[model samples]
Target: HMPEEEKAARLFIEALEKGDPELMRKVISPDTKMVDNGREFTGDEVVEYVKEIQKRGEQWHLKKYTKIGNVWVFYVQVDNNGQTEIWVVVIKVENGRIKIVFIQTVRDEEEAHEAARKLAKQA
Candidate 1:
Protein backbone atom coordinates (compact mmCIF):
# COMPACT_ATOMS: atom_id res chain seq x y z
CA HIS A 1 0.00 0.00 0.00
CA MET A 2 1.91 2.98 -1.30
CA PRO A 3 -0.12 5.58 0.50
CA GLU A 4 0.97 9.22 0.76
CA GLU A 5 3.45 8.71 3.62
CA GLU A 6 4.94 5.66 1.99
CA LYS A 7 5.15 7.48 -1.32
CA ALA A 8 6.94 10.32 0.38
CA ALA A 9 9.47 7.89 1.81
CA ARG A 10 9.96 6.33 -1.61
CA LEU A 11 10.44 9.75 -3.17
CA PHE A 12 13.24 10.39 -0.72
CA ILE A 13 15.11 7.41 -2.18
CA GLU A 14 14.23 8.36 -5.74
CA ALA A 15 15.67 11.79 -5.17
CA LEU A 16 18.86 10.15 -3.94
CA GLU A 17 19.12 7.72 -6.84
CA LYS A 18 18.63 10.47 -9.42
CA GLY A 19 20.82 12.92 -7.53
CA ASP A 20 18.17 15.57 -8.02
CA PRO A 21 18.30 18.47 -5.61
CA GLU A 22 14.94 19.88 -6.71
CA LEU A 23 13.23 16.61 -5.94
CA MET A 24 14.81 16.70 -2.51
CA ARG A 25 13.40 20.16 -1.90
CA LYS A 26 9.90 18.99 -2.70
CA VAL A 27 10.32 15.85 -0.59
CA ILE A 28 12.07 17.22 2.45
CA SER A 29 11.03 19.78 5.02
CA PRO A 30 12.99 22.98 5.51
CA ASP A 31 13.62 22.00 9.09
CA THR A 32 14.73 18.50 8.19
CA LYS A 33 17.56 17.19 10.32
CA MET A 34 19.91 14.31 9.61
CA VAL A 35 22.16 12.25 11.85
CA ASP A 36 24.93 10.48 9.98
CA ASN A 37 28.07 9.04 11.56
CA GLY A 38 26.88 10.72 14.76
CA ARG A 39 26.82 14.22 13.26
CA GLU A 40 23.74 16.31 12.61
CA PHE A 41 23.23 18.12 9.32
CA THR A 42 20.49 20.38 8.05
CA GLY A 43 18.16 19.33 5.25
CA ASP A 44 20.00 21.31 2.59
CA GLU A 45 23.29 19.88 3.71
CA VAL A 46 21.87 16.38 3.66
CA VAL A 47 20.78 16.85 0.08
CA GLU A 48 24.27 18.01 -0.75
CA TYR A 49 25.56 14.90 0.97
CA VAL A 50 23.44 12.83 -1.39
CA LYS A 51 25.09 14.51 -4.34
CA GLU A 52 28.49 13.86 -2.88
CA ILE A 53 27.75 10.16 -2.40
CA GLN A 54 26.38 9.80 -5.91
CA LYS A 55 29.45 11.52 -7.19
CA ARG A 56 31.44 8.83 -5.41
CA GLY A 57 29.39 6.15 -7.21
CA GLU A 58 27.58 4.82 -4.15
CA GLN A 59 24.06 3.72 -5.11
CA TRP A 60 21.09 3.41 -2.79
CA HIS A 61 18.43 0.74 -3.09
CA LEU A 62 15.42 1.00 -0.77
CA LYS A 63 14.44 -2.53 0.34
CA LYS A 64 11.69 -2.01 2.90
CA TYR A 65 9.74 0.93 4.23
CA THR A 66 7.17 1.16 6.99
CA LYS A 67 5.60 3.78 9.16
CA ILE A 68 5.44 3.22 12.90
CA GLY A 69 3.59 6.07 14.56
CA ASN A 70 5.02 9.28 13.00
CA VAL A 71 8.34 7.69 12.07
CA TRP A 72 9.15 6.29 8.66
CA VAL A 73 11.64 3.43 8.94
CA PHE A 74 13.46 2.22 5.86
CA TYR A 75 15.64 -0.81 5.24
CA VAL A 76 18.01 -0.03 2.41
CA GLN A 77 20.74 -1.94 0.63
CA VAL A 78 23.61 0.11 -0.67
CA ASP A 79 25.53 -0.74 -3.85
CA ASN A 80 24.02 -4.19 -4.28
CA ASN A 81 25.31 -5.31 -0.93
CA GLY A 82 23.44 -8.10 0.84
CA GLN A 83 23.73 -6.18 4.09
CA THR A 84 20.96 -3.72 4.81
CA GLU A 85 21.08 -0.45 6.66
CA ILE A 86 18.13 0.88 8.59
CA TRP A 87 17.16 4.48 8.44
CA VAL A 88 14.65 6.19 10.67
CA VAL A 89 12.98 9.28 9.29
CA VAL A 90 10.43 11.31 11.17
CA ILE A 91 7.91 12.76 8.76
CA LYS A 92 5.20 15.38 8.98
CA VAL A 93 2.46 14.84 6.43
CA GLU A 94 -0.19 17.35 5.50
CA ASN A 95 -2.15 17.93 2.30
CA GLY A 96 -0.69 14.79 0.73
CA ARG A 97 2.92 15.94 0.60
CA ILE A 98 5.45 14.42 3.04
CA LYS A 99 8.08 16.34 4.86
CA ILE A 100 11.03 14.64 6.56
CA VAL A 101 11.57 16.18 9.96
CA PHE A 102 14.43 14.02 11.22
CA ILE A 103 16.65 11.16 10.02
CA GLN A 104 19.01 8.65 11.56
CA THR A 105 20.91 5.92 9.74
CA VAL A 106 22.01 2.68 11.36
CA ARG A 107 25.01 1.10 9.69
CA ASP A 108 25.15 -2.05 11.78
CA GLU A 109 23.92 -4.51 9.20
CA GLU A 110 24.22 -7.63 11.32
CA GLU A 111 22.22 -6.13 14.13
CA ALA A 112 19.44 -4.97 11.83
CA HIS A 113 19.25 -8.33 10.04
CA GLU A 114 19.09 -10.23 13.31
CA ALA A 115 16.44 -7.88 14.62
CA ALA A 116 14.35 -8.32 11.49
CA ARG A 117 14.68 -12.08 11.69
CA LYS A 118 13.48 -12.02 15.25
CA LEU A 119 10.53 -9.80 14.37
CA ALA A 120 9.57 -11.98 11.40
CA LYS A 121 9.52 -14.97 13.70
CA GLN A 122 6.97 -13.23 15.90
CA ALA A 123 4.96 -12.02 12.95
Candidate 2:
Protein backbone atom coordinates (compact mmCIF):
# COMPACT_ATOMS: atom_id res chain seq x y z
CA HIS A 1 0.00 0.00 0.00
CA MET A 2 1.11 3.52 -0.69
CA PRO A 3 1.99 5.68 2.26
CA GLU A 4 -0.39 8.45 3.26
CA GLU A 5 1.69 11.15 1.66
CA GLU A 6 2.04 9.23 -1.61
CA LYS A 7 -1.69 8.72 -1.72
CA ALA A 8 -2.20 12.43 -1.29
CA ALA A 9 0.26 13.19 -4.07
CA ARG A 10 -1.33 10.60 -6.34
CA LEU A 11 -4.77 12.00 -5.74
CA PHE A 12 -3.56 15.49 -6.61
CA ILE A 13 -1.82 14.29 -9.76
CA GLU A 14 -4.82 12.25 -10.82
CA ALA A 15 -7.01 15.29 -10.39
CA LEU A 16 -4.62 17.25 -12.59
CA GLU A 17 -4.51 14.58 -15.29
CA LYS A 18 -8.30 14.52 -15.39
CA GLY A 19 -8.68 18.28 -14.91
CA ASP A 20 -10.91 17.67 -11.96
CA PRO A 21 -10.96 20.76 -9.77
CA GLU A 22 -13.38 19.26 -7.28
CA LEU A 23 -11.08 16.30 -6.77
CA MET A 24 -8.21 18.70 -6.20
CA ARG A 25 -10.28 20.43 -3.59
CA LYS A 26 -10.55 17.12 -1.75
CA VAL A 27 -6.78 16.75 -1.38
CA ILE A 28 -5.37 20.25 -1.45
CA SER A 29 -5.12 22.58 1.45
CA PRO A 30 -7.11 25.78 1.08
CA ASP A 31 -3.89 27.69 1.72
CA THR A 32 -1.84 25.62 -0.67
CA LYS A 33 0.88 27.56 -2.42
CA MET A 34 2.02 26.79 -5.95
CA VAL A 35 4.77 28.14 -8.15
CA ASP A 36 5.40 27.50 -11.82
CA ASN A 37 8.22 29.10 -13.79
CA GLY A 38 8.25 32.01 -11.31
CA ARG A 39 4.49 32.68 -11.11
CA GLU A 40 2.80 32.08 -7.77
CA PHE A 41 -0.70 30.92 -6.98
CA THR A 42 -2.86 30.07 -4.02
CA GLY A 43 -5.18 27.11 -4.00
CA ASP A 44 -8.07 29.17 -5.38
CA GLU A 45 -5.83 30.52 -8.11
CA VAL A 46 -4.70 26.98 -8.93
CA VAL A 47 -8.31 25.95 -9.45
CA GLU A 48 -8.80 28.84 -11.82
CA TYR A 49 -5.54 27.99 -13.55
CA VAL A 50 -6.74 24.47 -14.15
CA LYS A 51 -9.97 25.86 -15.52
CA GLU A 52 -8.00 28.04 -17.88
CA ILE A 53 -5.93 25.06 -19.01
CA GLN A 54 -9.11 23.13 -19.70
CA LYS A 55 -10.50 26.06 -21.63
CA ARG A 56 -7.36 26.07 -23.76
CA GLY A 57 -7.86 22.38 -24.59
CA GLU A 58 -4.74 21.29 -22.83
CA GLN A 59 -3.86 17.70 -21.95
CA TRP A 60 -1.53 16.46 -19.20
CA HIS A 61 0.33 13.20 -18.71
CA LEU A 62 2.21 12.35 -15.53
CA LYS A 63 5.30 10.18 -15.44
CA LYS A 64 8.29 9.19 -13.29
CA TYR A 65 7.13 9.79 -9.77
CA THR A 66 9.49 9.59 -6.77
CA LYS A 67 8.87 10.37 -3.17
CA ILE A 68 11.45 11.48 -0.61
CA GLY A 69 10.17 12.22 2.83
CA ASN A 70 7.12 14.47 2.49
CA VAL A 71 7.97 15.63 -1.02
CA TRP A 72 6.86 13.92 -4.20
CA VAL A 73 8.73 14.73 -7.39
CA PHE A 74 7.51 13.82 -10.86
CA TYR A 75 7.53 14.78 -14.51
CA VAL A 76 4.49 15.85 -16.42
CA GLN A 77 4.10 16.20 -20.16
CA VAL A 78 1.84 19.11 -20.91
CA ASP A 79 0.32 19.67 -24.33
CA ASN A 80 -0.98 23.20 -24.40
CA ASN A 81 -1.69 25.60 -27.22
CA GLY A 82 0.18 23.37 -29.67
CA GLN A 83 3.37 23.38 -27.61
CA THR A 84 4.52 20.37 -25.65
CA GLU A 85 6.98 20.35 -22.76
CA ILE A 86 7.93 18.20 -19.83
CA TRP A 87 7.97 19.95 -16.49
CA VAL A 88 9.13 18.68 -13.14
CA VAL A 89 6.67 18.98 -10.30
CA VAL A 90 7.48 18.80 -6.60
CA ILE A 91 4.54 18.43 -4.28
CA LYS A 92 5.01 18.84 -0.54
CA VAL A 93 2.42 17.32 1.72
CA GLU A 94 1.65 18.06 5.34
CA ASN A 95 -0.77 16.13 7.46
CA GLY A 96 -2.28 14.35 4.46
CA ARG A 97 -2.96 17.54 2.43
CA ILE A 98 -0.93 19.16 -0.26
CA LYS A 99 0.66 22.34 1.06
CA ILE A 100 2.98 23.39 -1.71
CA VAL A 101 3.49 22.60 -5.38
CA PHE A 102 6.50 23.67 -7.43
CA ILE A 103 6.73 23.18 -11.17
CA GLN A 104 9.60 24.05 -13.47
CA THR A 105 11.19 23.02 -16.73
CA VAL A 106 14.61 21.51 -16.10
CA ARG A 107 17.29 20.51 -18.52
CA ASP A 108 17.47 16.86 -17.55
CA GLU A 109 17.54 14.31 -14.78
CA GLU A 110 20.56 15.96 -13.18
CA GLU A 111 18.72 19.22 -12.74
CA ALA A 112 15.60 17.46 -11.52
CA HIS A 113 17.60 15.41 -9.06
CA GLU A 114 19.38 18.44 -7.68
CA ALA A 115 16.14 20.34 -7.38
CA ALA A 116 14.49 17.42 -5.63
CA ARG A 117 17.46 17.05 -3.31
CA LYS A 118 17.29 20.71 -2.36
CA LEU A 119 13.53 20.54 -1.80
CA ALA A 120 13.91 17.42 0.32
CA LYS A 121 16.57 19.13 2.44
CA GLN A 122 14.24 22.03 3.09
CA ALA A 123 11.40 19.75 4.02
Candidate 3:
Protein backbone atom coordinates (compact mmCIF):
# COMPACT_ATOMS: atom_id res chain seq x y z
CA HIS A 1 0.00 0.00 0.00
CA MET A 2 3.03 2.28 0.01
CA PRO A 3 1.45 3.95 2.98
CA GLU A 4 4.40 6.30 3.34
CA GLU A 5 2.75 8.82 1.08
CA GLU A 6 -0.47 8.46 2.97
CA LYS A 7 1.34 9.11 6.23
CA ALA A 8 3.00 12.18 4.83
CA ALA A 9 -0.31 13.46 3.59
CA ARG A 10 -1.81 13.00 7.03
CA LEU A 11 1.28 14.52 8.60
CA PHE A 12 0.50 17.82 6.89
CA ILE A 13 -3.08 17.80 8.18
CA GLU A 14 -2.02 16.83 11.70
CA ALA A 15 0.32 19.76 11.80
CA LEU A 16 -2.36 22.02 10.40
CA GLU A 17 -4.72 21.07 13.21
CA LYS A 18 -2.10 21.56 15.88
CA GLY A 19 -0.76 24.76 14.33
CA ASP A 20 2.70 23.22 14.41
CA PRO A 21 4.71 24.44 11.45
CA GLU A 22 7.76 22.44 12.51
CA LEU A 23 5.94 19.13 12.19
CA MET A 24 4.89 20.08 8.67
CA ARG A 25 8.37 21.38 7.93
CA LYS A 26 9.50 17.80 8.46
CA VAL A 27 7.43 16.47 5.55
CA ILE A 28 7.21 19.38 3.14
CA SER A 29 9.67 19.67 0.31
CA PRO A 30 11.66 22.87 -0.22
CA ASP A 31 9.88 23.24 -3.53
CA THR A 32 6.47 22.36 -2.20
CA LYS A 33 3.59 24.38 -3.60
CA MET A 34 -0.07 24.80 -2.79
CA VAL A 35 -2.89 26.22 -4.89
CA ASP A 36 -5.98 27.31 -3.04
CA ASN A 37 -8.74 29.21 -4.81
CA GLY A 38 -6.51 30.66 -7.51
CA ARG A 39 -3.82 31.59 -4.99
CA GLU A 40 -0.39 30.03 -4.79
CA PHE A 41 1.77 29.47 -1.72
CA THR A 42 5.20 27.93 -1.64
CA GLY A 43 7.80 26.57 0.75
CA ASP A 44 7.78 28.17 4.20
CA GLU A 45 4.81 30.28 3.22
CA VAL A 46 2.74 27.12 2.99
CA VAL A 47 3.92 26.12 6.45
CA GLU A 48 2.63 29.40 7.84
CA TYR A 49 -0.79 28.79 6.34
CA VAL A 50 -1.22 25.78 8.60
CA LYS A 51 -1.52 28.29 11.39
CA GLU A 52 -4.14 30.11 9.34
CA ILE A 53 -6.21 26.96 9.22
CA GLN A 54 -5.94 26.59 12.98
CA LYS A 55 -6.96 30.14 13.73
CA ARG A 56 -10.24 29.77 11.87
CA GLY A 57 -11.13 26.33 13.15
CA GLU A 58 -10.59 23.50 15.59
CA GLN A 59 -11.25 19.75 15.53
CA TRP A 60 -10.38 19.47 11.87
CA HIS A 61 -11.49 15.95 11.08
CA LEU A 62 -10.51 13.78 8.17
CA LYS A 63 -13.84 12.11 7.62
CA LYS A 64 -12.76 10.30 4.48
CA TYR A 65 -9.60 9.77 2.47
CA THR A 66 -8.35 7.47 -0.26
CA LYS A 67 -5.10 6.88 -2.04
CA ILE A 68 -4.29 6.16 -5.67
CA GLY A 69 -0.64 5.81 -6.50
CA ASN A 70 1.37 8.62 -4.91
CA VAL A 71 -1.65 10.86 -4.54
CA TRP A 72 -4.13 11.12 -1.67
CA VAL A 73 -7.60 12.59 -1.59
CA PHE A 74 -8.69 13.96 1.76
CA TYR A 75 -12.21 14.98 2.63
CA VAL A 76 -11.92 17.13 5.72
CA GLN A 77 -14.81 18.49 7.75
CA VAL A 78 -14.12 21.65 9.65
CA ASP A 79 -15.85 23.69 12.32
CA ASN A 80 -15.27 27.37 11.73
CA ASN A 81 -17.49 29.75 13.65
CA GLY A 82 -20.04 26.95 13.96
CA GLN A 83 -20.25 26.67 10.19
CA THR A 84 -19.66 23.52 8.16
CA GLU A 85 -16.97 23.09 5.54
CA ILE A 86 -15.83 20.12 3.55
CA TRP A 87 -12.37 20.78 2.21
CA VAL A 88 -11.04 18.62 -0.55
CA VAL A 89 -7.34 18.64 0.13
CA VAL A 90 -5.42 16.65 -2.45
CA ILE A 91 -1.80 15.84 -1.74
CA LYS A 92 0.94 14.41 -3.91
CA VAL A 93 4.03 13.12 -2.18
CA GLU A 94 7.48 13.04 -3.68
CA ASN A 95 9.52 10.48 -1.76
CA GLY A 96 9.20 11.50 1.90
CA ARG A 97 8.09 15.04 1.27
CA ILE A 98 4.81 16.45 0.05
CA LYS A 99 5.48 18.14 -3.26
CA ILE A 100 2.06 19.47 -4.23
CA VAL A 101 -1.17 20.42 -2.54
CA PHE A 102 -4.45 21.30 -4.25
CA ILE A 103 -7.29 22.65 -2.19
CA GLN A 104 -10.94 23.17 -3.07
CA THR A 105 -14.36 23.23 -1.50
CA VAL A 106 -16.24 19.98 -1.94
CA ARG A 107 -19.96 19.59 -1.44
CA ASP A 108 -20.14 16.03 -0.14
CA GLU A 109 -18.97 12.46 -0.43
CA GLU A 110 -20.02 12.09 -4.06
CA GLU A 111 -18.02 15.10 -5.17
CA ALA A 112 -15.04 13.78 -3.30
CA HIS A 113 -15.43 10.44 -5.02
CA GLU A 114 -15.51 12.16 -8.38
CA ALA A 115 -12.47 14.18 -7.37
CA ALA A 116 -10.58 10.97 -6.68
CA ARG A 117 -11.43 9.77 -10.17
CA LYS A 118 -10.46 13.03 -11.84
CA LEU A 119 -7.13 13.25 -10.11
CA ALA A 120 -6.49 9.59 -10.80
CA LYS A 121 -6.66 10.15 -14.52
CA GLN A 122 -4.49 13.27 -14.24
CA ALA A 123 -1.93 11.30 -12.26
Candidate 4:
Protein backbone atom coordinates (compact mmCIF):
# COMPACT_ATOMS: atom_id res chain seq x y z
CA HIS A 1 0.00 0.00 0.00
CA MET A 2 2.98 2.31 0.47
CA PRO A 3 4.02 2.97 -3.10
CA GLU A 4 6.47 5.69 -2.23
CA GLU A 5 8.58 3.41 -0.08
CA GLU A 6 8.40 0.70 -2.70
CA LYS A 7 9.63 3.08 -5.36
CA ALA A 8 12.52 4.13 -3.21
CA ALA A 9 13.55 0.51 -2.83
CA ARG A 10 13.21 -0.09 -6.57
CA LEU A 11 15.40 2.92 -7.18
CA PHE A 12 18.00 1.51 -4.81
CA ILE A 13 18.08 -1.84 -6.62
CA GLU A 14 18.21 0.00 -9.93
CA ALA A 15 21.23 1.99 -8.83
CA LEU A 16 22.99 -1.10 -7.55
CA GLU A 17 22.25 -3.13 -10.69
CA LYS A 18 23.42 -0.30 -12.95
CA GLY A 19 26.44 0.42 -10.71
CA ASP A 20 25.68 4.11 -10.83
CA PRO A 21 26.73 6.11 -7.82
CA GLU A 22 24.72 9.04 -9.07
CA LEU A 23 21.55 7.01 -8.99
CA MET A 24 22.51 5.76 -5.56
CA ARG A 25 22.68 9.32 -4.38
CA LYS A 26 19.30 9.99 -5.93
CA VAL A 27 17.58 7.34 -3.83
CA ILE A 28 19.42 7.62 -0.54
CA SER A 29 19.38 10.43 1.94
CA PRO A 30 22.44 12.65 2.10
CA ASP A 31 23.42 11.08 5.40
CA THR A 32 22.23 7.60 4.65
CA LYS A 33 23.61 4.87 6.90
CA MET A 34 24.29 1.26 6.04
CA VAL A 35 25.23 -1.66 8.23
CA ASP A 36 26.47 -4.55 6.13
CA ASN A 37 27.00 -7.53 8.41
CA GLY A 38 28.46 -5.41 11.24
CA ARG A 39 30.50 -3.11 9.00
CA GLU A 40 29.12 0.35 9.56
CA PHE A 41 29.01 2.89 6.74
CA THR A 42 27.52 6.28 6.34
CA GLY A 43 27.16 9.10 3.83
CA ASP A 44 29.84 8.73 1.17
CA GLU A 45 30.81 5.39 2.62
CA VAL A 46 27.37 4.05 1.84
CA VAL A 47 27.64 5.15 -1.77
CA GLU A 48 31.04 3.59 -2.12
CA TYR A 49 29.84 0.36 -0.56
CA VAL A 50 26.94 0.09 -2.97
CA LYS A 51 29.11 0.87 -5.94
CA GLU A 52 31.65 -1.71 -4.92
CA ILE A 53 29.17 -4.52 -4.41
CA GLN A 54 27.60 -3.83 -7.77
CA LYS A 55 30.84 -4.81 -9.45
CA ARG A 56 30.74 -8.24 -7.78
CA GLY A 57 30.10 -11.02 -10.31
CA GLU A 58 26.82 -12.06 -8.76
CA GLN A 59 23.19 -11.95 -9.82
CA TRP A 60 20.33 -10.76 -7.62
CA HIS A 61 16.82 -12.14 -7.77
CA LEU A 62 13.97 -10.80 -5.70
CA LYS A 63 12.57 -13.80 -3.93
CA LYS A 64 10.01 -12.28 -1.56
CA TYR A 65 9.30 -8.96 0.12
CA THR A 66 7.07 -7.30 2.64
CA LYS A 67 6.83 -4.03 4.49
CA ILE A 68 6.00 -3.13 8.05
CA GLY A 69 5.54 0.52 8.89
CA ASN A 70 8.42 2.44 7.28
CA VAL A 71 10.60 -0.63 7.16
CA TRP A 72 10.77 -2.93 4.15
CA VAL A 73 12.24 -6.41 4.18
CA PHE A 74 13.49 -8.10 1.05
CA TYR A 75 14.46 -11.71 0.63
CA VAL A 76 16.95 -11.73 -2.21
CA GLN A 77 18.71 -14.68 -3.76
CA VAL A 78 22.25 -14.11 -4.99
CA ASP A 79 24.14 -16.50 -7.20
CA ASN A 80 27.90 -16.44 -7.66
CA ASN A 81 30.36 -19.07 -8.84
CA GLY A 82 27.70 -21.78 -8.90
CA GLN A 83 26.71 -21.06 -5.30
CA THR A 84 23.32 -19.65 -4.50
CA GLU A 85 22.46 -18.00 -1.19
CA ILE A 86 19.78 -15.86 0.30
CA TRP A 87 20.26 -12.40 1.74
CA VAL A 88 17.90 -10.43 3.86
CA VAL A 89 18.14 -6.73 3.14
CA VAL A 90 16.15 -4.26 5.15
CA ILE A 91 15.43 -0.74 4.01
CA LYS A 92 13.99 2.09 6.01
CA VAL A 93 12.44 4.85 3.93
CA GLU A 94 11.36 8.18 5.22
CA ASN A 95 10.37 11.43 3.59
CA GLY A 96 10.16 9.57 0.29
CA ARG A 97 13.81 8.43 0.38
CA ILE A 98 15.87 5.69 1.89
CA LYS A 99 17.59 6.47 5.17
CA ILE A 100 19.21 3.16 6.00
CA VAL A 101 20.18 -0.16 4.46
CA PHE A 102 20.79 -3.31 6.49
CA ILE A 103 22.02 -6.50 4.91
CA GLN A 104 23.28 -9.83 6.25
CA THR A 105 24.00 -13.11 4.57
CA VAL A 106 21.93 -16.17 5.43
CA ARG A 107 24.57 -18.80 4.79
CA ASP A 108 28.33 -19.14 4.93
CA GLU A 109 29.21 -22.18 2.91
CA GLU A 110 32.96 -21.96 3.44
CA GLU A 111 32.60 -21.62 7.16
CA ALA A 112 30.11 -24.45 7.31
CA HIS A 113 32.33 -26.65 5.19
CA GLU A 114 35.31 -25.99 7.47
CA ALA A 115 33.35 -26.85 10.58
CA ALA A 116 31.94 -29.99 9.04
CA ARG A 117 35.32 -31.29 7.94
CA LYS A 118 36.94 -30.50 11.26
CA LEU A 119 34.19 -32.22 13.19
CA ALA A 120 34.23 -35.21 10.89
CA LYS A 121 37.99 -35.69 11.22
CA GLN A 122 38.14 -34.88 14.97
CA ALA A 123 41.88 -35.46 14.87
Best by lDDT: 2
- Pairs of colliding residues, candidate 1: none
lDDT score of residue 120 within candidate 4: 25
| Cα lDDT, model 4, residue 63 | 67
TM-score between model 1 and native: 0.65
TM-score of 4: 0.74
| Ranking 2 against 3 by TM-score, winner | 2
Q: TM per model?
A: 0.65, 0.86, 0.85, 0.74
lDDT of all predictions, in order shown?
0.60, 0.80, 0.77, 0.69
Q: How far is candidate 3 from the true structure (C-alpha RMSD, Å)?
A: 2.2
Give the deviation of candidate 2 from the true structure as CA RMSD.
1.8
Give the higher-TM-score candidate: 1 or 2. Answer: 2
In Å, residue 93's CA in model 4 sits off its true spot by: 0.6
Please list all clashing residue pairs in model 4, or write none if there are none: none
Model 4 score (lDDT): 0.69
Best by TM-score: 2
Give stretches of model 2 more than 4 Å off.
119-123
Q: Between prediction 3 and prediction 4, which has the larger TM-score?
A: 3
**Clash count for each candidate, listed in order shown:** 0, 0, 0, 0
* Tens-digit lDDT string for candidate 4 (4-93): 779898777667656678888878766787777678788888778666767775677776666645576666777777988776677777
